[PDB]
From a paper:
The endoglucanase 3 (known also as Cel12A) of Trichoderma reesei (TrEG3) and Trichoderma harzianum (ThEG3) constitute an example of these CBM-less enzymes. On the other hand, these enzymes are particularly active in the amorphous regions of cellulose or in the hydrolysis of soluble oligosaccharides, which suggests that the catalytic core of these enzymes not only possesses the catalytic functions, but might also bear CBM-like motifs specific for interactions with amorphous regions of the substrate. In this study, we report the three-dimensional structure of ThEG3 obtained from X-ray crystallography and investigate enzyme-substrate interactions using molecular dynamics (MD) simulations. We identify amino acids at the body of Cel12A that play key roles in substrate binding and, thus, provide a structural basis for the fact that Cel12A enzymes relinquish a cellulose-binding module.
We solved the crystallographic structure of endoglucanase 3 from Trichoderma harzianum at 2.07 Å resolution and performed molecular dynamics simulations on this new structure with the aim to shed more light on the Cel12A dynamics and its binding mechanism oligosaccharides. The β-strands are connected via several loops and three α-helices (H1, H2 and H3). The concave part of the leaflets constitutes the catalytic cleft, which binds to the cellulose chains during the hydrolysis. Figure 1D shows the catalytic residues Asp100, Glu117, and Glu201, strictly conserved in the glycosyl hydrolase family 12. The distance of 5.6 Å between Glu117 and Glu201 is typical for the nucleophile/acid catalyst pairs involved in the hydrolysis mechanism that gives rise to retention of the anomeric configuration of the reaction product. The ThEG3 is composed by 220 residues and has high primary sequence identity (83%) with TrEG3, with just two additional residues. Like TrEG3, there is an evident row of hydrophobic residues in one of the edges of the cleft, formed by Tyr7, Trp23, Val58, Phe203, and Ile128. Close to the acid catalyst Glu201, ThEG3 has another acid residue, Asp96, whereas TrEG3 has Asn95. The simulations suggest that a CBM-like cluster of key residues located in the loops at one end of the catalytic cleft is responsible for recognizing and binding the polymeric substrate.
Residue numbers in the entry: 1 to 226
Amino acid sequence: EAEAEFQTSCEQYAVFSGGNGYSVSNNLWGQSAGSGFGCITVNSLNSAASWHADWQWSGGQNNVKSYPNVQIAIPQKRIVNSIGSMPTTASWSYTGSNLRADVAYDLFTASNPNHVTYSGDYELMIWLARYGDIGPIGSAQGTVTINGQSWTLYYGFNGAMQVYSFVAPSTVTNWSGDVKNFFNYLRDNKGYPASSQYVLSYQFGTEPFTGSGTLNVNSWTASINV
């Protein structure tokens, strides 16, 4: 027997697209660094994305094995400061054991609108969860308030890329926000050049190190407006 609408794969670079501009990617870019597997299953792509990633990784204790994620298409890149809003909602859960992984938004920006979309002048991460001894790069900058919620801000370098990571003080399995609030904070408190940086990508997923786990994304939405 068989079924259509089959949007499941354990392939390194499997990608499924549909609904309002969503693509779900297995993205096992660091699979070389370990042993095991990563799979994704798309339940539904409409106005929202529903999907799950299932994985088991051992070895390469200190290396990300993958970033299975959902993201939105951005055919036309726009300047951060010109973008009106970047609303998003996320409803998710993690199951498994010995989880060394995170759950986070990931966005890249650059002054070059044709920059490759998987890196940039800057990277903005918003971590909704963290398991085990894994954390963002850089060093703690302190706690900040964005739209009435606390985040611990980290700041560091990857080569020439500057990375800002906003980490929730406890797991947030159910969230709603606007990434514009985070850019505004960086612009007004950190000298982030919002007037000259283009949003290259807008992703949400998990970075697994080791363990065995299933990230279930009950629902995710995101868009870039005006």
